[PDB]
């Protein structure tokens, strides 16, 4: 019976809330009160990448920390040599409405997707000496929001149809599907071991999934609006989420509750991208107010501001070695900070 | 060794210039409408599991790209953000005096959306033929859904098309005013709304979009070239 099921769900929610409350003894702020502050950090633009004719959405750093891919609404995917600003490949897309891209860990394949509901896998190395579509992963019922490579043969993609799928590139058919969300999935991050991933779906909640069992392990709540950016902590035990309510939050899987909230009264705009430094001390968040802020992950204090961009910041990414951070924006410019 | 990288980068730049020209000379439009709106026929009028459709047509040597959202979810607040660089947004509303209030709400949301505060909206009042027969039938109880109609009179300077009865003119001008009040409610003037009356099968639709885009580009040029 519907009412009985709803009552049981409410009672179990109360039980879970009681477990959360009994599991908390002190806040991260109280424990870290003795940790010395990170202090003010000053970062200068080292590269300004030009050659895009439309607002940029997503960029991914390569495993070598040198090559990065970018996606713009003009229909071009450009692979930039960040060391010299040179362009290595320019891929004319079949659909100009791209919103996400991913660079394979081996670097042999690059993927993208958007409003077409199709993920296009582009092969960068071939005897023909040209870039061609290796496979198109059609089958989604909504716009693709995020794409990440688990392996050269497997890619996990998020869509606005409240569903996430693990695709097989060789056969082009879904291997597993995740359907526990109730809203548009915006971004997902892969754990360092690729054994787990988390995503936010415009329902003010973040959920943890298993790529083999195909089921949600944990559900995280506490946000007041749509979650736009999600990123794992470098150690893989915690993750940070950014939402439209102008606040970032840190969640730990083992504690299964919010640890810290990064809020400032001067911010009344949402967060577009969230990323962690290699050590995890610095939390970098992109904002709709034309600049990015760096937060002390432990002290929750604002350590610095990056205001080079003249438009909305769309994508933020940190190199695997943590040498530099590249911030994209709707001004059709990518700026690398160090 | 490294010189080949610069050579291929310059080749890429040269390839990018000759499609940058196309991108600059191209005009992009978004076709928004309800399920009952005759936007499907409007697309058919234009002539030279996918989530988005594209239509190619040109009037007076200028190329227009019109995008229609196909297999998509009704969570507009997220994917609508992409169409903030389109020259104009074509909004089609069905005269069903009541799905019209939902159309008003959608238009209001589009107008007040933060990232759509700079795009002119080309408003098409589609299916005027159905409205004419409905109002002439006497069962068009517009007053029940919109009480302001019982205390509204046609503007003195209104120009009615020949052969249209006063009742049809009053009803359709009230429908225009319902959108114009929302459009002017902002009072900022960054973007303009162009209300038009059109039918599902009409050849003048291409000219209307051409003129609206010309006006929008002229208004943009006034600001770009230090005139205002």
């Amino acid at each position: 019976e519907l009412d009985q099921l709803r009552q049981e769900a409410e009672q179990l929610k109360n039980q879970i809330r009681d477990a959360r409350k009994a599991c908390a003894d002190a806040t991260l702020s109280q424990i870290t009160n003795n940790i010395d502050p990170v202090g003010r950090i000053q970062m200068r633009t080292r590269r300004t990448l030009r050659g895009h004719l439309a607002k940029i959405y997503a960029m991914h750093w390569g495993t070598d920390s040198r090559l990065l891919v970018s996606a713009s609404q003009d229909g071009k995917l450009i692979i930039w040599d960040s060391y010299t600003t040179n362009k290595v490949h320019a891929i004319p897309l079949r659909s100009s409405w791209v919103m996400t891209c991913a660079y394979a860990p081996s670097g042999n394949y690059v993927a993208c997707g958007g409003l077409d509901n199709i993920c296009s896998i582009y092969n960068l190395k071939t005897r023909e000496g040209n870039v061609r579509v290796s496979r198109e992963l059609a089958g989604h019922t909504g716009y693709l929001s995020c794409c990440r490579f688990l392996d050269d043969n497997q890619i996990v993609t998020s869509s606005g149809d409240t569903t996430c799928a693990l695709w097989d590139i060789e056969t082009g058919q879904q291997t597993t599907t995740f359907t526990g969300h109730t809203g548009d999935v915006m971004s997902l991050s892969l754990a360092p071991d690729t054994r787990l991933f988390v995503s936010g779906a415009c329902d003010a909640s973040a959920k943890l999934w298993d790529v083999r069992e195909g089921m949600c392990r944990q559900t995280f709540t506490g946000h007041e609006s749509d979650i736009n950016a999600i990123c794992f902590f470098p150690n893989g035990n915690a993750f940070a989420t950014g939402s439209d309510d102008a606040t970032c939050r840190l969640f730990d899987l083992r504690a299964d509750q919010e640890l810290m909230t990064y809020s400032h009264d001067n911010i009344i705009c949402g967060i577009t991208s969230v990323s962690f430094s290699k050590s995890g001390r610095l939390l970098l968040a992109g904002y709709d107010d034309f600049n990015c802020n760096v937060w002390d992950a432990l002290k929750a204090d604002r350590a610095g501001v990056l205001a080079g961009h003249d438009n909305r910041v769309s994508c933020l990414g940190v190199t695997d070695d943590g040498m530099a951070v590249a911030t994209g924006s709707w001004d059709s410019f990518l700026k690398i900070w160090n | 060794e490294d010189k080949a990288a610069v050579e291929r980068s310059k080749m890429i730049e040269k390839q990018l210039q000759k499609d940058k020209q196309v991108y600059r000379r191209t005009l992009r439009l978004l076709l928004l409408g309800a399920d009952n709106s005759g936007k499907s026929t409007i697309v058919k009028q234009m002539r030279i599991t996918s989530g988005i459709f594209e239509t190619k047509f040109q009037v007076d040597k200028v190329n227009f790209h019109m995008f229609d959202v196909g297999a998509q979810r009704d969570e507009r607040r997220k994917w609508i953000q992409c169409f903030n660089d389109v020259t104009a947004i074509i909004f089609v509303v069905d005269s069903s005096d009541n799905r019209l209030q939902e159309a008003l709400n959608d238009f209001k949301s589009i107008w007040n959306n933060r990232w759509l505060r700079t795009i002119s909206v080309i408003l098409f009042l589609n299916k005027q033929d159905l409205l004419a027969e409905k109002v002439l039938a006497g069962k068009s109880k517009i007053e029940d859904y919109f009480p302001e109609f019982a205390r509204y009179t046609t503007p003195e300077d209104a120009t009615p098309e020949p052969g249209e009865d006063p009742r049809v003119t009053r009803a359709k001008y009230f429908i225009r005013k319902e959108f114009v009040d929302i459009s002017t409610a902002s009072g900022d003037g960054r973007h303009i709304c162009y209300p038009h009356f059109t039918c599902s099968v009409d050849t003048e639709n291409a000219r209307r979009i051409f003129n609206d885009c010309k006006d929008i580009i002229l208004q943009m040029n006034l600001r770009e070239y230090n005139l205002v």
Partner: nanobody
Amino acid sequence: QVQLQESGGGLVQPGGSLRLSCAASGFTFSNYKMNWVRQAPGKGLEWVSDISQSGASISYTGSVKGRFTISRDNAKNTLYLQMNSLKPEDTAVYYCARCPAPFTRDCFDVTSTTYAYRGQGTQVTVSS
């Protein structure tokens, strides 16, 4: 967690009055624009009224203009909808909806496909 618990409803004779109240929790109520939505039997969701953060801007749908009044109490995170002169056509389940983001003017809460930021609603029946 963000939740909206509506209260009131029931059966009211035509021409009577009925007050609907919703308790808001899990978010900062004083920064989000609120809305009312109803779904009549065999009909899609219909927007009713809106109220800004401070209440200085209010709008109503034509069918209820002059009959329904919307008020909010930021001091106790409660939203009110005082209904008068009920009619048989008003029978429907009423939902309380919130804007997706704070400090925003436009809204897209009429979506039927599982809008996260609305409650389960309270049934209202107008009959003899």
